[PDB]
Design an enzyme around this catalytic site. Structure first.
Site, PDB file in Angstrom:
ATOM      1  N   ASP A  89      39.104 -40.349 -48.840  1.00 15.04           N
ATOM      2  CA  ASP A  89      39.164 -41.264 -49.575  1.00 15.04           C
ATOM      3  C   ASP A  89      38.414 -40.609 -50.732  1.00 15.04           C
ATOM      4  O   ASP A  89      37.791 -41.593 -51.464  1.00 15.04           O
ATOM      5  CB  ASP A  89      38.560 -42.276 -49.035  1.00 15.04           C
ATOM      6  CG  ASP A  89      39.021 -43.659 -50.157  1.00 15.04           C
ATOM      7  OD1 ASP A  89      39.982 -44.055 -50.658  1.00 15.04           O
ATOM      8  OD2 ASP A  89      37.836 -44.454 -50.233  1.00 15.04           O
ATOM      9  N   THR A  90      38.231 -39.582 -51.334  1.00 10.82           N
ATOM     10  CA  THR A  90      37.546 -39.162 -52.392  1.00 10.82           C
ATOM     11  C   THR A  90      38.385 -38.636 -53.409  1.00 10.82           C
ATOM     12  O   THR A  90      38.775 -39.167 -54.524  1.00 10.82           O
ATOM     13  CB  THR A  90      36.417 -38.181 -52.072  1.00 10.82           C
ATOM     14  OG1 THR A  90      36.852 -36.962 -51.457  1.00 10.82           O
ATOM     15  CG2 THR A  90      35.142 -38.649 -51.157  1.00 10.82           C
ATOM     16  N   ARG A 129      36.529 -49.668 -49.382  1.00  9.86           N
ATOM     17  CA  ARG A 129      37.182 -50.675 -50.340  1.00  9.86           C
ATOM     18  C   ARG A 129      37.699 -51.870 -49.166  1.00  9.86           C
ATOM     19  O   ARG A 129      38.981 -51.985 -49.006  1.00  9.86           O
ATOM     20  CB  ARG A 129      38.103 -50.294 -51.373  1.00  9.86           C
ATOM     21  CG  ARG A 129      37.715 -50.006 -52.472  1.00  9.86           C
ATOM     22  CD  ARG A 129      38.557 -48.926 -53.383  1.00  9.86           C
ATOM     23  NE  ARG A 129      39.693 -48.505 -52.444  1.00  9.86           N
ATOM     24  CZ  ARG A 129      39.423 -47.276 -52.185  1.00  9.86           C
ATOM     25  NH1 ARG A 129      38.280 -46.547 -52.595  1.00  9.86           N
ATOM     26  NH2 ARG A 129      40.499 -46.505 -51.275  1.00  9.86           N
ATOM     27  N   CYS A 142      26.880 -33.374 -52.400  1.00 15.57           N
ATOM     28  CA  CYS A 142      28.240 -33.376 -51.798  1.00 15.57           C
ATOM     29  C   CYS A 142      28.501 -31.867 -51.010  1.00 15.57           C
ATOM     30  O   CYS A 142      28.597 -30.884 -51.793  1.00 15.57           O
ATOM     31  CB  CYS A 142      29.242 -33.667 -52.784  1.00 15.57           C
ATOM     32  SG  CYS A 142      30.975 -33.646 -52.108  1.00 15.57           S
ATOM     33  N   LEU A 143      28.707 -31.827 -49.907  1.00 13.26           N
ATOM     34  CA  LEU A 143      29.286 -30.689 -49.259  1.00 13.26           C
ATOM     35  C   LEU A 143      30.836 -30.530 -49.467  1.00 13.26           C
ATOM     36  O   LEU A 143      31.379 -29.411 -49.158  1.00 13.26           O
ATOM     37  CB  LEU A 143      29.030 -30.554 -47.723  1.00 13.26           C
ATOM     38  CG  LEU A 143      27.596 -30.391 -47.321  1.00 13.26           C
ATOM     39  CD1 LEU A 143      27.374 -30.685 -45.992  1.00 13.26           C
ATOM     40  CD2 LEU A 143      27.108 -29.036 -47.612  1.00 13.26           C
ATOM     41  N   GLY A 144      31.480 -31.208 -49.983  1.00 16.69           N
ATOM     42  CA  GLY A 144      32.984 -30.830 -49.936  1.00 16.69           C
ATOM     43  C   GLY A 144      33.446 -30.764 -51.644  1.00 16.69           C
ATOM     44  O   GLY A 144      34.742 -30.476 -51.897  1.00 16.69           O
TER      45      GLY A 144
HETATM   46  C1  HEM Z   1      35.827 -36.115 -56.039  1.00 16.83           C
HETATM   47  C2  HEM Z   1      35.509 -36.076 -54.632  1.00 16.83           C
HETATM   48  C3  HEM Z   1      34.208 -36.060 -54.108  1.00 16.83           C
HETATM   49  C4  HEM Z   1      32.935 -36.814 -54.553  1.00 16.83           C
HETATM   50  C5  HEM Z   1      33.131 -37.689 -55.834  1.00 16.83           C
HETATM   51  C6  HEM Z   1      31.881 -36.778 -53.609  1.00 16.83           C
HETATM   52  C7  HEM Z   1      30.704 -37.456 -53.861  1.00 16.83           C
HETATM   53  C8  HEM Z   1      29.698 -37.262 -52.643  1.00 16.83           C
HETATM   54  C9  HEM Z   1      28.358 -38.015 -52.706  1.00 16.83           C
HETATM   55  C10 HEM Z   1      28.089 -38.815 -53.956  1.00 16.83           C
HETATM   56  C11 HEM Z   1      27.914 -37.731 -51.668  1.00 16.83           C
HETATM   57  C12 HEM Z   1      26.358 -37.828 -51.167  1.00 16.83           C
HETATM   58  C13 HEM Z   1      26.060 -39.518 -50.948  1.00 16.83           C
HETATM   59  C14 HEM Z   1      24.577 -39.784 -50.534  1.00 16.83           C
HETATM   60  O1  HEM Z   1      23.644 -39.129 -51.090  1.00 16.83           O
HETATM   61  O2  HEM Z   1      24.506 -40.874 -49.758  1.00 16.83           O
HETATM   62  C15 HEM Z   1      28.598 -36.750 -51.045  1.00 16.83           C
HETATM   63  C16 HEM Z   1      28.347 -35.984 -49.566  1.00 16.83           C
HETATM   64  C17 HEM Z   1      29.133 -35.669 -48.827  1.00 16.83           C
HETATM   65  N1  HEM Z   1      30.428 -35.131 -49.194  1.00 16.83           N
HETATM   66 FE1  HEM Z   1      31.256 -35.343 -50.941  1.00 16.83          FE
HETATM   67  N2  HEM Z   1      32.473 -36.297 -52.755  1.00 16.83           N
HETATM   68  C18 HEM Z   1      33.854 -35.701 -52.719  1.00 16.83           C
HETATM   69  C19 HEM Z   1      34.680 -34.925 -51.901  1.00 16.83           C
HETATM   70  C20 HEM Z   1      34.360 -34.651 -50.460  1.00 16.83           C
HETATM   71  C21 HEM Z   1      35.182 -34.021 -49.718  1.00 16.83           C
HETATM   72  C22 HEM Z   1      36.645 -33.707 -49.920  1.00 16.83           C
HETATM   73  C23 HEM Z   1      34.894 -33.879 -48.545  1.00 16.83           C
HETATM   74  C24 HEM Z   1      35.259 -33.246 -47.280  1.00 16.83           C
HETATM   75  C25 HEM Z   1      36.449 -33.213 -46.891  1.00 16.83           C
HETATM   76  C26 HEM Z   1      33.484 -34.326 -48.849  1.00 16.83           C
HETATM   77  C27 HEM Z   1      32.223 -34.210 -47.721  1.00 16.83           C
HETATM   78  C28 HEM Z   1      30.854 -34.623 -47.950  1.00 16.83           C
HETATM   79  C29 HEM Z   1      29.956 -34.686 -47.135  1.00 16.83           C
HETATM   80  C30 HEM Z   1      30.082 -33.804 -45.649  1.00 16.83           C
HETATM   81  C31 HEM Z   1      28.651 -34.806 -47.562  1.00 16.83           C
HETATM   82  C32 HEM Z   1      27.457 -35.221 -47.113  1.00 16.83           C
HETATM   83  C33 HEM Z   1      26.192 -34.408 -47.425  1.00 16.83           C
HETATM   84  C34 HEM Z   1      24.739 -34.914 -46.613  1.00 16.83           C
HETATM   85  O3  HEM Z   1      24.763 -35.977 -46.223  1.00 16.83           O
HETATM   86  O4  HEM Z   1      24.102 -33.933 -46.648  1.00 16.83           O
HETATM   87  N3  HEM Z   1      33.062 -34.898 -50.170  1.00 16.83           N
HETATM   88  N4  HEM Z   1      29.935 -36.635 -51.485  1.00 16.83           N
HETATM   89  C1  LIG Z   2      29.403 -41.852 -50.667  1.00 15.03           C
HETATM   90  C2  LIG Z   2      30.655 -40.745 -50.018  1.00 15.03           C
HETATM   91  C3  LIG Z   2      31.401 -40.534 -51.029  1.00 15.03           C
HETATM   92  C4  LIG Z   2      29.554 -39.670 -49.487  1.00 15.03           C
HETATM   93  C5  LIG Z   2      30.968 -38.728 -48.849  1.00 15.03           C
HETATM   94  C6  LIG Z   2      32.066 -39.942 -48.040  1.00 15.03           C
HETATM   95  C7  LIG Z   2      31.159 -41.366 -48.594  1.00 15.03           C
HETATM   96  C8  LIG Z   2      31.725 -42.619 -48.578  1.00 15.03           C
HETATM   97  C9  LIG Z   2      29.871 -41.250 -47.432  1.00 15.03           C
HETATM   98  O1  LIG Z   2      29.880 -42.135 -46.806  1.00 15.03           O
HETATM   99  C10 LIG Z   2      29.310 -39.827 -47.987  1.00 15.03           C
END
Ligand code: HEM
Ligand SMILES: CC1(C)[C@@H]2CC[C@@]1(C)C(=O)C2
Ligand SMILES: [K+]
EC number: 1.14.15.1
Length: 404
Positions: A241-242, A176, A347-349
């Protein structure tokens, strides 16, 4: 507004701006879902933010996220200069290359680690909420939504809590942007911060998330310092930021809907099903892909190099995916969504996020069962790669609460 490209037909032009949508005052989810009105095609071109395609329906979002030979992750952000600067691992890689890096990432933020962090998540949520309980009021975004997810992340990363203001400032300029920094300056400021740390934990390996990544292996070979940094940066944004934004959407809604509060107070075993339903209705991420070659998709000629935003938020909002999608229903029988992504980058988180969400609802409602938006407040939402809430003032009568 950018010059409509020769290959784009006039009848598919819909000038939606993801960082400041027209109906924003109605709710960010409501602003985004103007793209699902009867008048709008399944795939539009917007002239804002340098121009890019936008798929508007769940059917196309899912098909495009699955097809990585045409819809590449190499430049996944809008604007074009942000997607080109984006080099986080694993998110900027496509399979097969991407795959080895997911299992290192899975080791620092997956279920096993949600299991190591189980006591500490529970404790910090109880202790934060109990400290607010007697006041009868809070600025939720600042008093819980940020510190709960953030301090767990800094704890896991082995980073000090007074680095929080600097890192959240920077992470937030990547999703943002307020104008002061470009995505690239923001990114390079995050790497600058991570560089000494990564090198220090490669000499003296510890137990924290940064040491594990930095001293990790990728399908049997050692990860390099540049790969460690690129994976490490991505975890910080995900950590700061999620869930922080997600919790504010859910608490705003609960503050406005006494019957939904009652459902969860009465049947707390419904909390996990309710978390899923809220993840659909208050879905908040929208990133996308770039075309690897010229391609025809659902009748529209796409051009090599074109960018396409595939809003993860829009799939569960789709009336073709869920009946009466704007209505929150905790017993919804098939909750369909793409909130945590789709395809090989799922999403891994998400296991960490769901635990933080379910612990927050159970522990809030246990102590402060009844609460509302403060008298005369009008909540303002904000839009971007990750959407959120600018402020959420809540009020309650302390006589109705319980120290648990
Ligand atoms: C409500 C909480 C969250 C939402 C809605 C969310 C959503 C997403 C989405 C939509 C993606 C894939 C984006 C793409 O395909 O370009 C993603 C990937 C990922 N997120 Fe989450 N995320 C959340 C929380 C988190 C948290 C808390 C962590 C770690 C502290 C995290 C770590 C990751 C990682 C490492 C990936 C990469 C997967 C890859 O590229 O193989 N996320 N997330
Ligand atoms: C689109 C996302 C939510 C996903 C995790 C953080 C984010 C901003 C990325 O850069 C990957
Ligand atoms: K890139």
């Amino acid at each position: 507004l950018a010059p409509l490209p020769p290959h784009v037909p006039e009848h598919l032009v819909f000038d939606f701006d993801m960082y400041n949508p027209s109906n924003l005052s109605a709710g960010v989810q409501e602003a985004w879902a103007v793209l699902q009105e009867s008048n709008v095609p399944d795939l539009v071109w917007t002239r804002c933010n340098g121009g890019h395609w936008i798929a508007t329906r769940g059917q196309l979002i899912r098909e495009a996220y699955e097809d990585y030979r045409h819809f590449s992750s190499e430049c996944p952000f809008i604007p074009r200069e942000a997607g080109e600067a984006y080099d986080f691992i694993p998110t900027s890689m496509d399979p097969p290359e991407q795959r080895q890096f997911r299992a290192l990432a899975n080791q620092v933020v997956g279920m096993p680690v949600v299991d190591k962090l189980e006591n500490r998540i529970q404790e910090l949520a109880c202790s934060l909420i109990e400290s607010l309980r007697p006041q009868g009021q809070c600025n939720f975004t600042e008093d819980y939504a940020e510190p709960f997810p953030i301090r767990i992340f800094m704890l896991l990363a082995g980073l000090p809590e007074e680095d929080i203001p600097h890192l959240k400032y920077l992470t937030d300029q990547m999703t943002r942007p307020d104008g002061s920094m470009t995505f690239a300056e923001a990114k390079e400021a995050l790497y600058d911060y991570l560089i000494p740390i990564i090198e220090q934990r490669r000499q003296k390996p510890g137990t924290d998330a940064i040491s594990i990544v930095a001293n990790g292996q990728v399908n049997g070979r050692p990860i390099t310092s540049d790969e460690a940094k690129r994976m490490c940066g991505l975890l910080l944004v995900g950590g700061l930021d999620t869930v922080v934004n997600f919790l504010s959407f859910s608490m705003e809604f609960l503050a406005k809907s006494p019957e939904h509060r009652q459902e969860l107070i009465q049947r707390p075993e419904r909390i996990p099903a309710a978390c899923e339903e809220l993840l659909r209705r208050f879905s908040l991420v929208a990133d996308g892909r770039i075309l690897t070659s010229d391609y025809e998709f659902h009748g529209v000629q796409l051009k090599k190099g074109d960018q396409i935003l595939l809003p993860q938020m829009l799939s569960g909002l789709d009336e073709r995916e869920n009946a009466c999608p704007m209505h929150v229903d905790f017993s919804r029988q098939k909750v369909s969504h793409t909130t945590f992504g789709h395809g090989s980058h799922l999403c891994l988180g998400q296991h960490l996020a769901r635990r933080e969400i379910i612990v927050t609802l159970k522990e809030w409602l246990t102590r402060i069962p009844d609460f509302s938006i403060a008298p005369g407040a009008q909540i303002q939402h904000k839009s971007g790669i990750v959407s959120g809430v600018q402020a959420l003032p809540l009020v309650w009568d302390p006589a109705t609460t319980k120290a648990v």
